[PDB]
């Protein structure tokens, strides 16, 4: 995988020119795209900018995020050929920092369950996860140093885990979702994919300009609370094997690890995530459902058809439960620095299953809003398995810091 | 002005036909458009729908809100002829309820300070306010029974007061802003314009389907807290004339009125509203500012140019200040049901001043997020003056209930 930190360093000293770095990415995309299919559109003419911390840095953009120079098709036939007038604010944050938007990466239709044609870089017979399929696969295949995706359920952390890349779903609403196709406004969060936690920090620093992302260093003796999210049921063997390996490596590296049960209120929040999500989706995709119903990809069409009845009353109650969950979750972080849990149910599903994977181990955290970071741990049968590091809301820096610590601990 | 609730009742009993009601709006529009200039585009072919609570109800939509069958030009030459692919979720809420989207009402460029060509219905020589210029004007000129607008500063409450219409800026984030051009995501809130409080209530019931908007009746013996927002500056005589009149009428109606002071934390939130708004505006309009700078209307271009230096640090601090303000504001509602204050500095400015009016008595509330309702009170020199009713966050119903009580109180 291409390291954003490495490129920045070599570009800053003058060892690598911005143009050469971009040419590198075009070549890397050309090398594996015919086998992975991570891009909806690769702008072969994309050039490097001459200034900024991200000069010479190629970035892939999930196709539900607006671009003014390339189409944004939402992974749906309904938006085939659709060309937004402006670049979404998050896209502009990257461009103003000197980055090159090298192409639009694949997304499932409207960021839901319907699989894209993208294949897992580690084994093409498997799913790269979703809904940020192409962004995870592109980074995983060593095509680009950075990519943007989104998470409403587990569309950033799950695919990152399946593809063995580092990734972060920042604190809710920190990055604007303007120009980002909405599924659920109470949940949609923009995320980033990269080689390592350090790359994610560098990316957020250039995008936001916030000092909290400057000078991040691996955490020392982090106080970790292991949460297996029992309410979501047991995970597949590979995921547990990965968590156990992460725990052992953390303990050997000096971290204090303890198993913790989340408050009942939090379990309830996990239970109603679907209510909030599906109720809002009907409002957010109202035009599509009302005017192009049969044109909506099969799985999403089915889920929407099955939830037309969700009422404003049960929705409001769900939100109340969600808010209480966030409050009580904060109490958990009084005795621990970060939470460690699963990033997915197990290894990436075979493409034959027509599934991007169950988001059950990701959804609670999107609703709570906390910053989540995927840390690649190991591989079973050649397929990546990762773990999820979670910090207090707004403590993104420390989540990246602990993730970095975990990466080093796993490398020994 | 046309009453939505009136049309509803008559249509429901068969006393009035939906086609007749719609034909009446088309007529009212043509009757005074060449005088008011409230519409960017009037869809003369629009007809009444066959079912739903809003059948036969013509609705004007502020032109920063997406429509699939009509251009959405954002009041800017940059978006001339721009045609969104879909109808914004809030537009679909209206259509699904049976409403007729009769046209797009004028908006200042990107909903900022640049005046439109729309004139105040009460006096063609005066401004109708902004940024929802056309929606307030159209309703005030008796053209339509309902109109959608937005508020970031005071773009719903102020123009409503200027044009003498009822209007509500609901609790922040209740109505989705998907498909609504963003200025500041921490503030942008969709609002409604109507003849009276009752009309707004029926509109929200149809759009949201929430029981809280069903069966709303005038409030009884409301507990009112009068806040003149001294921290906002010196008010014009006309506005104080209206506030005193409202207080007198309320007291005579049985309301318990008392002047109260707002927590210093709240005064501070008012002070930093500009920091939040302008910093986010740069991110939200990054593409336009970077790629079409000289094409941005004069006044907005100047405000953006003057605020390019706002830092993430001071912005983050401003947001922290906003949160403290919200936290301490809640305590104020322990003794009073609603707060009562000015809706604008005074009477609508003359067009010659090239100003849509100062939002200083409005901005605080958009940041706090509480529901706000404008209640027309009286006229000075032929120009409307209203008062602003404010309820606790989430209590939009009570805000409307109390606004109703006030309208009838002023009606002696």
Which string of DSSP letters, residue by residue, matches A378-394? Answer: EEETTEEEEEEEEESTT
The residue of B51, B95, B152, B286 whose CB has the most chain A CBs within 10 angstroms, and thus the best one to mutate to test that interface, is: B286
Strand ranges inside A227-382, DSSP E:
256-259, 338-342, 372-380
Interchain pair A89, B286: CB under 8 A: yes
CB contact under 8 A, A287 and B68: yes
* Angle (deg, nearest 10), helices A237-252 and A396-411: 90
Pairing of strands B166-169, B223-226: unpaired
Contact assignment for A287 to B86 by CB distance below 8 Å = yes
**Residue A9 touches partner B, C-beta closer than 8 Å:** no
Structure tokens at B195: 């003849």
φ/ψ of residue A60, rounded to 5: -95, 140
How many Å apart are CA A131 and CA A137, to the nearest integer?
11
| Helix/strand/coil for B332 | helix
Instruction: Give Dmax over CA atoms of chain B in angstroms.
Output: 61
Alpha helices in B234-311 (DSSP H): 237-252, 264-284, 286-291, 298-306
Query: What residues of chain B lie within 8 A of the CB of A316, using their CB?
Result: 210
What SS3 state is found at A341?
Answer: strand
Would you call A312 and B79 a contact, using CB atoms and an 8 Å cutoff? Answer: no
DSSP β-ladder status, B58-62 and B100-105: parallel
Which strand (E) or helix (H) includes residue B168? strand B166-169
Q: Which residue has the tokens 């085939």?
A: A80
Instruction: Judge whether A95 is closer than 8 Å to chain B, CB to CB.
Output: yes
User: Tokens 């580690």 sit at which residue?
Assistant: A122
CA distance B389 to B18: 33
Topology at the third CATH level for domain A1-412: Amidase signature (AS) enzymes (3.90.1300)
- Put simply, the answer to whether A284 touches B176 (Cβ < 8 Å) is yes
- The answer to whether the CB atoms of B208 and A173 lie below 8 A apart is no
| Chain A hits for B283, Cβ within 8 Å | 89, 92-93, 176
Residues B55 and B5: their CA atoms lie apart, in Å, by 12
Which is nearest to B78 in space by CA: B311, B293, B262, B244?
Answer: B293
Pairing verdict, β A189-194 and A166-169? antiparallel
CA dihedral A167, A171, A172, A174 (to 10 degrees): -100
Resolution in A: 1.8
Question: Which residues of B, range 147-176, sit inside 8 Å of A by Cβ?
Answer: 173, 176
DSSP state of B65: B
For chain B, say whether A290 makes contact (Cβ under 8 Å).
yes
Of B354, B328, B199, the residue nearest B267 (C-alpha): B328
Contact B210 A185 (CB under 8 A): no
State the Cα–Cα distance between residues A114 and A302, nearest whole angstrom: 11
Which H/E stretch holds residue B160? helix B157-163
Q: Do B284 and A176 touch (CB under 8 A)?
A: yes
Q: Which two tokens stand for residue A153?
A: 């359920």
Residues with Cβ within 8 Å of residue B1, at least 6 apart in sequence: B139, B140, B142, B145, B165, B195
DSSP secondary-structure letter at B123? B
Check: CB of residue A406 under 8 Å from CB of residue A249: yes
Q: What single-letter DSSP state applies at residue B331? A: H
CA–CA min distance A86, chain B (Å): 6
Please tell me the distance from the alpha carbon of residue B182 to that of residue A86, in angstroms, as a whole number.
Answer: 12
Q: Nearest CA of chain A to the CA of B280: how many Å?
A: 9
Q: Half-sphere exposure (CA, 13 Å, Cβ side) for B324?
A: 16
CA-to-CA separations, A143 to A95, A140, A157, A165, B261, in angstroms, rounded? 19, 8, 19, 12, 60
SS3 A359: coil
Instruction: Put residue A261 in one of left, alpha, beta given phi > 0 → left and psi -120 to 50 → alpha.
Output: beta
Chain B nearest-CA distance from A95, in A, is: 10
Best probe of the A interface among B71, B283, B317, B322, by most A CBs < 10 A, is B283
Question: Is any Cβ of chain B less than 8 angstroms from the Cβ of A316?
Answer: yes
Residue of B86, B211, B283 lying closest to A93 (CB–CB): B283
Report d(CA B5, CA B194) in Å as an integer: 10
- Residue ranges of alpha helices (H) inside A209-255 are 237-252
Contact: A92, B182; criterion CB under 8 Å? no
Nearest CA in chain B to A313: B210
Specify the residue for token string 């429901």.
Answer: B12
Rounded to the nearest angstrom, the minimum Cα separation between B400 and chain A is: 19
Q: Do A92 and B283 touch (CB under 8 A)?
A: yes
B341 SS3 class: strand
CA nearest to B270, candidates B358, B181, B377, B396 = B358
For the four alpha carbons of B212, B215, B218 and B223, in that order, the dihedral sign comes to negative
Of B68, B85, B312, the CB nearest to A210: B312
Of the candidates B93, B290, B311, the beta carbon closest to that of A96 is on: B290
How many beta-carbon contacts under 8 Å exist across A and B?
82
CA–CA gap between residue A117 and residue A107 (Å, rounded) = 10
Give B20→chain A minimum CA distance, Å.
26
Cβ atoms within 10 Å of A45's Cβ, excluding its own: 8
User: What method did the depositors use to determine the structure?
Assistant: X-ray
Q: Residue A116 and residue A106: Cα distance in Å, rounded?
A: 7
- Cα–Cα distance for residue pair A260/A339, rounded to 1 Å: 9
């Amino acid at each position: 995988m291409i390291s954003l930190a490495d490129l920045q360093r070599r570009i800053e000293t003058g060892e690598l020119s911005p143009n050469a770095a971009i040419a590198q990415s075009h070549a890397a995309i050309e090398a594996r795209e015919k086998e992975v299919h991570a891009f909806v559109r690769h702008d072969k003419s994309a050039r490097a900018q001459a200034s900024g911390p991200l000069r010479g840095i190629a970035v892939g953009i999930k196709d539900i995020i607006d671009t003014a120079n390339m189409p944004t098709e939402m992974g749906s036939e309904i938006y085939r050929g659709w060309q937004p007038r402006s670049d979404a604010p998050v896209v502009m944050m990257l461009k103003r920092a000197g980055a090159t938007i090298i192409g639009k990466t694949t997304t499932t239709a409207f960021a839901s369950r319907d699989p894209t044609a993208t294949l897992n870089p580690h084994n093409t017979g498997h799913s790269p996860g979703g809904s940020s399929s192409g962004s995870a696969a592109a980074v995983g295949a060593g095509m680009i140093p950075l990519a943007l995706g989104t998470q409403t359920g587990g569309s950033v952390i799950r695919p990152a885990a399946y593809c063995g890349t580092a990734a972060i779903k920042p604190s809710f609403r920190m990055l604007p979702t303007v120009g980002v196709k909405c599924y659920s406004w109470a949940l949609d969060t923009v995320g980033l994919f990269g080689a390592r936690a350090e790359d994610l920090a560098r990316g957020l620093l250039a995008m936001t300009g916030r000092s909290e992302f400057s000078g991040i260093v691996p955490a020392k003796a982090p106080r970790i609370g292991v949460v297996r999210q029992e309410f979501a049921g047991a995970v597949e063997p590979a995921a547990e094997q990965g968590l156990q390996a992460a725990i052992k490596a953390a303990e050997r590296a000096g971290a204090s690890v303890q198993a913790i049960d989340l408050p009942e209120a939090v379990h309830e929040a996990w239970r109603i995530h679907p209510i909030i999500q599906d109720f809002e989706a009907h409002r957010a995709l109202a035009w599509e459902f009302s005017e192009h119903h049969d044109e909506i990809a099969p799985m999403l069409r089915a889920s929407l058809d099955a939830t037309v009845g969700l009422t404003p009353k049960e929705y409001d109650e769900a939100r109340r439960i969600g808010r209480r969950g966030r409050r009580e979750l904060g109490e958990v972080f009084e005795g621990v620095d970060v939470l460690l849990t699963y990033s997915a149910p197990g290894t990436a599903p075979a493409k034959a299953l027509a599934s991007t994977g169950d988001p059950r181990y990701n959804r609670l955290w999107t609703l709570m809003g906390n910053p989540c970071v995927n840390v690649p741990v190991l591989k079973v049968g050649g397929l990546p398995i990762g773990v999820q590091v979670i910090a207090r809301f707004g403590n993104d820096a420390h989540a990246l810091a602990t993730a970095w610590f975990l990466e080093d601990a796993l490398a020994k």
